[PDB]
Symmetry: C3
């Protein structure tokens, strides 16, 4: 009854109380454009974009100094009075500010593009209540490999439906020139943190256009039914196919994706520590280049119920450390019959420098007995004895239960691998001598003639058995061994006047299987199997001095001293009658080849040269 309208009250600014009250009633963008500020620099809150679009709200301040900026329908809203309202924001741009459909019904790429332009490429898609749909490539601003920008595409749980045969994210400067042979790239991008990229699986969905996006860190994202995380099919620069360059795919959750990388060539590629579940294909870089892949690392990934993890071309400097493979039987795996393909395979070039360490190749039952299956398939270049240029791959400490871990005969060095249900011999690969319980030893010892020369018999070597006797078990002590005793006959000043080499064979055996009366002493029998010496050769062309034949039909004798054995040769006559004087010593470089296999578990025979 007692009612005074607020329009009859005047605020000190000159505007009515009704106009002051109206600044708390700004629900939509249209309400702001129809609102006139009461003071200069006023900040008001707009609730949402429209009555149907519940996102896009925020604070807007009337920039009284700006009378020319255009309305962009997101961060600069121009009122009917001409007031330039500008959104207050110091973080990442939200495509919802510009009207991106958070229900996933319509293509929001144009609105995502608007958020890219005002944020210098730093876009954030919000929480899990939002689901966006992008069907048009969005271009990131141009930033060279040495540029001053850092771009990010991230979120707080939102979902992005992807519809693109080439990549919903690319370089802005390639838009309109998508098929250009020029390097229209942009670099330095973090993408995926807090984002769920998803495809429907019945159409093409590519997230990153690898033709145009270099130096990319893809981490922390979920990818579901995505045809390819990265794709590149555009020839440019020195390449006749598309290629990817400096892409790191790490710590993601991949599921039901057709490919991780889809291209023909790669530079500095990393795909490590990703949880991949039921993916139909991994890293495909199977072009015919020399090489196709310049460095790839695939470490600590999970690859379960999946297809071919990597179908690669020629690979230089490849590493695959600690991957987890379990029950993979889909995608191209039933046809290629391998988890990894390297060069050369078919038209592909030869690989060079690839190392597999600590992988588990847990096979589905179908490939345990498939004679045409190998975990890693390739052809090495072995027609020449020299392997300098095209180094075949090596395998260290891996575990498989498949028919084969690699193509038979294509690997030269491998140790520590496990072939559960199969055998190493089937791979036609060399076995390291260590796994045959063969160990090598060596020593250098000087035998002065004044001490080790009696009646033409010269001591040439000394071995010890004291550590053999120290072993606890009788069955560990015995061993056999070869000896290469390189003898250099020298004067007092170490001038070499002669040279020879002896080949000796040994057997070491003590008490074995004996309780009462057993001893720790172990005995050696030696036999001179070979001998050769130089009988000539000018070593001093000024004074006419030649290497001297010091031994005349030598015979080997050994003598036990304590626990040691002195090996000696007969028929010794020292050189003399020259500028350098007489031979004062025999300097012996002894190298032993010990065969440790005995009745016990000894892997290294403890005989050694002193």
């Amino acid at each position: 009854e007692v009612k005074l309208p607020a329009d009859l009250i005047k605020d000190s600014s000159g505007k009515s109380q009704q106009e002051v009250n109206n600044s708390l009633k700004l629900k939509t963008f249209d309400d702001l454009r129809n609102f006139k500020p009461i003071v200069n620099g006023q900040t008001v809150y707009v609730g949402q974009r429209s009555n149907t679009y519940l996102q896009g709200g925020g604070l807007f301040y009337a920039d009284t100094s700006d009378t020319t900026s255009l309305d962009n329908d997101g961060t600069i809203l121009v009122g009917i009075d001409g007031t330039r309202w500008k959104r207050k924001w110091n973080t990442h741009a939200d495509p919802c500010w510009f009207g991106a459909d958070y229900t996933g019904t319509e293509d929001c790429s144009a609105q995502v593009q608007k958020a890219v332009d005002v944020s210098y490429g730093r876009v954030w898609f919000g929480n899990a209540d939002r689901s966006f749909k992008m069907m048009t490539p969005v271009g990131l601003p141009t930033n060279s490999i040495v540029g001053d920008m850092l771009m990010e595409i991230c979120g707080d749980g939102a979902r992005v439906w992807v519809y693109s045969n080439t990549g919903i994210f690319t370089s802005k400067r390639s838009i309109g020139l998508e098929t250009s042979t020029d390097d229209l790239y942009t670099a330095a991008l973090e993408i995926g943190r807090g984002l769920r990229f998803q495809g429907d699986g019945v159409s093409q969905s590519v997230v990153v256009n690898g033709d145009r996006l270099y130096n990319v860190n893809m981490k922390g994202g979920r990818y579901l039914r995505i045809s390819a995380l990265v794709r590149a099919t555009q020839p440019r620069r020195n390449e006749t196919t598309g290629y990817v360059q400096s892409v790191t795919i790490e710590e993601n959750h991949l599921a039901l994706c057709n490919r991780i990388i889809d291209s023909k060539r790669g530079f500095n590629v990393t795909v490590s520590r990703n949880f991949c579940e039921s993916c139909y294909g991994g890293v495909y870089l199977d072009g015919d280049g020399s090489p196709a892949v310049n460095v790839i690392r695939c470490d600590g990934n999970l690859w379960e119920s999946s297809g071919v993890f990597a179908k690669l071309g020629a690979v230089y400097a490849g590493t695959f450390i600690g991957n987890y493979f379990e029950g993979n039987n889909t995608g191209d795996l039933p046809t290629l019959k391998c988890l990894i393909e390297l060069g050369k395979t078919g038209t592909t070039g030869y690989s060079s420098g690839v190392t597999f360490i600590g992988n588990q190749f847990g096979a589905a039952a179908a490939y345990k007995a498939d004679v045409n299956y190998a975990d890693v398939k390739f052809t090495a270049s072995l027609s020449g004895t020299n392997l300098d240029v095209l180094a075949p791959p090596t395998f260290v400490g891996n575990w498989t239960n498949a028919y084969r871990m690699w193509s038979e005969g294509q690997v030269v060095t491998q140790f520590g691998n496990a072939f559960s249900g199969g055998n190493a011999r089937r791979h036609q690969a060399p076995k390291l001598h260590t796994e045959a319980r063969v160990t090598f030893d060596l020593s250098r010892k000087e035998f002065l003639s004044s001490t080790n020369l009696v009646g033409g018999v010269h001591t040439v070597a000394e071995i010890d058995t004291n550590l053999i006797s120290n072993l606890a078990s009788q069955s560990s002590r015995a061993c056999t061994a070869d000896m290469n005793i390189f003898m250099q006959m020298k004067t007092a000043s170490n001038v070499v006047l002669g040279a020879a080499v002896a080949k000796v064979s040994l057997v070491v055996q003590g008490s074995e299987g004996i309780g009462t009366g057993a001893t720790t002493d172990v005995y050696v029998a030696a036999s001179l199997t070979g001998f050769t010496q130089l009988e000539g050769g000018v070593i001093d062309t000024v004074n006419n001095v030649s290497l001297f034949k010091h031994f005349t039909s030598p015979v080997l004798t050994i003598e036990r001293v304590g626990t040691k054995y002195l090996l000696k040769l007969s028929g010794y006559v020292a050189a003399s009658g020259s500028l350098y004087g007489a031979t004062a010593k025999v300097f012996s470089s002894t190298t032993m080849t010990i065969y440790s296999l005995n009745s016990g578990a000894s892997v290294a025979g403890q005989i050694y040269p002193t």
Copy 2:
């Protein structure tokens, strides 16, 4: 004196000016529930939850279309007039919205659970001024390994006091059925970014229930006096104990934690690049399974003043690359006397495929001379000569100063390791031939009879010394070597009519210790140590052709040509009188074993076959 009450002024909405003014006085949640909106879709700001609870404030809009939603005391607040007020938020849920005690006095798990339910598992705990206490497991929504969700538990520095024997975070669908043998799991979780999990050290605190949380990335968090980051004790599926599956613990700050992982079985486990200070235990997965651990990687960790870093059972495909151990002497280390335990140890099964690369085992003074200490303790399965199934672990490029790096006699392949203050021999392990300065060479050369056959003497091999002479130092030149000359006698069309092998021993020596008159030429003396040839064997059952004895008591002669040496055998008579014709050449596959040890620093003798 001149006072008109605001209740006598009417706003265009129909409500009084006093009611318009009241929308700026909403301090607590009770003020909002007692407030009636002036327009439809009005957004007002609530300052805090109550007069005592200073958090939980935010913007709320009157959803005029909603007349049925229930009050949840956090994001949907229903007023006395029936207005459904809904919080404006597009980011992560804050448990403080629902009343989580930010002082750490009362259990806030129920409020954390409320934030989980409305955020699809994306909870954020705020800044370092907050300290929460959780004593009841909070369950994350169900998401399979191929599910469409990505969940996160993160913060901006807040602290969470943990009180749980099983894990404050688990799967929601396991709540009420915690002891179920079914796989009531949920997957895809990022946890720890910007969060400080802390226990009091006098009670049980577990962060992640590994029985129910799979595909977990634990990164960026601080953990202080936490009994276990991950624990799993519930048997399920094919396992008779609890197990962890696809857990990655990376880039965290661990201090005074009792265990990193506490279970008996593991699948696809990663614990890398964590700063661990004074932790009493690391990765414990020491069940009796075959195996206990299916792939584990522990790389680049810091482990100082700590206990046993890893007490594991049987491990398949294990890798430990580049860890940093320094002065560890607490926890179970004084009893187990090792930094890492592998299978087999006690009841545990045998390991297969484990590689240690580039670790530093910096011991406390107590374990440098402890004969019962080894950095890595295990028992290998060496009763058979074949090591295909149970591949013993290998060690490459590690550094220790402890008594032992591994259990004596249990390692077959190891190179590049450093045993400061100790010795390699004490490990009873084979020494690679490369470390004994032994190098291998090989060549294939054809010696046509028309060129290399004079009076029954046939040239069979050719070695060169030109690169020996090229060496700068005299002491590097000399060497000795063995020769395996596999000779295949072939016709013009490369039909093999005979086969033999010669064993040759060589010594190479030139000027050494000589100034005036020295020459670069080095001389070779050879000796035929062994010879054998095939004298029969049907190779053509249709025409009745057998392998022919080409040599009759051969004698070895050598001839110096330039810098090369031609090795020749006598008593040669070519095969003839058959369908294939006469022997036209000797095709020699020469393999050399070079013993490089001399008076200099030569590690590879530069004699080689041509």
Copy 3:
């Protein structure tokens, strides 16, 4: 015309309507300090700091309980009426709250310091529209290695211009005592996420003071023309130079930086997976310590058009896995002529335990033919035959096209490496026997005398050719081999009464080059090259039993049985007439050295002992 001033309307709080209206007109900090709250606990919005400073706005509530807190010009603003206004914030502190110049014109370090103090070291710099300049070190609060804090320096794209010779970020407790020899450190820091650190390149810019900041994760940042990411030059504790401790530099974008790390000593250093473009220097830790670096890992980095990647001192437990080097020719590289320098070089100590796996050393054209260039330069300690203490570095699976991959003669173990355009021999390094197509085999077989003794001829070994015949290609079958047959003569209860060893040489050859009439059978010829046996040695000192000479001038014969070959020795007489009885069997531990080189691509000869 009909105008009632708002000052004549009274709100229920007792304040006039004009004062109520004024709470929506608070543009600057001065407007808030001049504003009096209408109710207790009122929250008002301040638009910005001043009319010229457009940042720093936010919500402030009148804390009626606080009458003593001082104004800090950022989060606590005290009004003229004495009202303590406190900013509502539960996230990271913004230096703009305190007036940090977002245009980069003036030093904002004092304002950054204010944000550190109120956030417990959790500072956030905002979006790419901001560019700050810091010229004074900002100190982080004290937190020990076992402390309860987690600190972060991050942003949302902002740029920070860096001007500091020591580090714009350091420990607070070192300020004023910067040259102290005490360990005035603080630990647990995440720095760089969403931040662009930039220098002008004509002055000193260091981001992290490594003398005072330990346990640092530097990830996700862009660094442009920064003199050093980490620098440490202050001697302290047991060190005579500065050092870095537990610094991880991972997943960054480095460009045109002078150094990554600039110091003389390091502990637990990680520099992995960084995109480095045109950087003039990497990890410099080249002090004379023993060692200089306690564990360093540099994995998966990009290093293009850059300088020396790592000039290190003595390194213990170093790893370099999978780096990508391409066309580096600037910085110190033209003078040092290497990509990596290790100890010893010059005054630097010797390294021990360093492994290079899977790197690509892609050289600029200038270093392909430079005889003074090597990818990794160092001097190994090879004056002694024993390499236990100072283990030389090893190289596995790397790829280079430079003149050398390492300093000649300084590497002992290396395999799988590629030397495009060069050769392995030039490195003066041993070649693993596997690359020479040499493979080892072994077996243990018991030959009971009742079965394998006829007329003094005793079967001592059995080899099989069945798998040789199984090979598809004729050229793959043939091979030669050595045999070490360790024979232990035992009684029925396995008491060793004798021991001997035979050296045998073999040649295996079948049909080769033959179509019609060819057979799969392959034939063996054996020759006894060496033999030795023990003829004495007390094994039972109680009963006076010695090892017995079982063989009297033995002659080797072989017999083909199916596909097997039985090797036999003559002159056998069993021991007898003692407490243990007679010799009942010959237990043979056979170890074979197979030389697989033939006319085909065989790398492992398929002869084996049974």
